[PDB]
């Protein structure tokens, strides 16, 4: 198996809620920081986000040993389906700046 | 602060060195006043890249 | 000695199960930094050399030495004749 | 940085055996049930999950580092 389905949902729900992801390039640290506490390693985050990039559902950037990922409109459509959320929700970013 | 390094990236050539440094400047001022008015005067002209720190009793 | 007691179990098995008045079979190991304890006397060990196992019959005079002291990692040198470039006068012009 | 000289005790991985799903329950009479292989005395594994029978042991496949009885 790549990972338990319990882990895979917890990455996608945090990505859909926040609109962005950040991780360092190191496969050995036992826990990802922040709301990926309650047990998932950052190796599962790197491998999950790679599979989401090759579908076209996230953009990727890299500098000084860190990945950065941004969610995009086709990925919002796919995750709202996969997480079974109501069609009206957009929880991350909405209000126009000045 | 001082750091001294070889100039070459690869270990070939005549043996030249680079000498890098950084200098830090520090000052103290003491006042005889209420705690309510240091908060006023320690808030103007402080716009440039200077650290400012204050402690409520040291004199 | 966390999981280094496993060699002592295999050695005392081999001392127990040998025919009466005959030598044990070899136990073969990577553990070159094991100290010879008085439990280990009159025993056959194969000690790894970087590519092969060399057998040792543990005499009681070996007590307090390392197992790696009796199995050597190289061949003694004996020289062939010097080649081109070995001295300043040795230079070749076509 | 060379051509490779091959080993000769070759396997890729083992093959996992294939068997039909369930033989741990029996119907003996209309409405009479028997359970043929036992649950382990345990907190999470206390129901619906069974110990193996070997020739000299009973073993829990779920609690796999432990839960072995020597008969």
């Amino acid at each position: 198996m790549l990972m338990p389905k319990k882990n895979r949902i917890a990455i996608y729900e945090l990505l859909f809620k926040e609109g962005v992801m950040v991780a360092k390039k190191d496969v050995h640290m036992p826990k990802h920081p922040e709301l990926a506490d309650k047990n998932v390693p950052n190796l599962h985050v790197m491998k999950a986000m790679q599979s989401l990039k090759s579908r076209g559902y996230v953009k990727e950037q890299f500098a000084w040993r860190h990945f950065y990922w941004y969610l995009t409109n086709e990925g919002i459509q796919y995750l709202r389906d996969y997480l079974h959320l109501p069609p009206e929700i957009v929880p991350a970013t909405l209000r126009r700046s000045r | 602060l001082r750091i001294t390094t070889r100039k070459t990236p690869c270990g070939e050539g005549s043996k030249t060195w680079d000498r890098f440094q950084m200098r830090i400047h520090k000052r103290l001022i003491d006042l005889h006043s209420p705690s309510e008015i240091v908060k006023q005067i320690t808030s103007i002209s402080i716009e440039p890249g200077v650290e400012v720190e204050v402690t409520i009793a040291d004199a | 000695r966390r999981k280094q007691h496993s060699l002592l179990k295999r050695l005392r098995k081999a001392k127990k199960e040998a025919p009466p008045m005959e030598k044990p079979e070899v136990v073969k190991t990577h553990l070159r930094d094991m100290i010879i304890l008085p439990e280990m006397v009159g025993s056959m060990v194969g000690v790894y050399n970087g590519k092969t196992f060399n057998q040792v019959e543990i005499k009681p005079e070996m007590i307090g030495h390392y197992l790696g002291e009796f199995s050597i990692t190289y061949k003694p040198v004996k020289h062939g004749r010097p080649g081109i470039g070995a001295t300043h006068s040795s230079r070749f012009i076509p | 940085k060379k051509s490779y000289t091959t080993p000769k005790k070759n396997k890729h991985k083992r093959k996992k055996v294939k068997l039909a799903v369930l033989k741990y329950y029996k119907v003996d009479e209309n409405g009479k049930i028997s359970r043929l292989r036992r649950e382990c005395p345990s907190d999470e594994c206390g129901a619906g999950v069974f110990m193996a029978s070997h020739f000299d042991r009973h073993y829990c496949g779920k609690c796999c580092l432990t839960y072995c009885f020597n008969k």
Partner: protein, 53 residues
């Protein structure tokens, strides 16, 4: 998956590596920099070091 998949790395050249490029040779531990010597000559101006003498 294996239970023995790492060895101790609490000191020596196995513990530490460059913060910019992950290299292990010729790094600077002074003042908490932890850069490689080739990466330091590249960023020294932005960090705030200068040469005068």
């Amino acid at each position: 998956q294996q239970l023995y998949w790492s060895h101790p790395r609490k000191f020596g050249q196995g513990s530490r590596s460059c913060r910019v490029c992950s290299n292990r040779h010729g790094l600077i531990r002074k003042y908490g920099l932890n850069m490689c010597r080739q990466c330091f000559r590249q960023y020294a101006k932005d960090i705030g070091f200068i040469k005068l003498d």
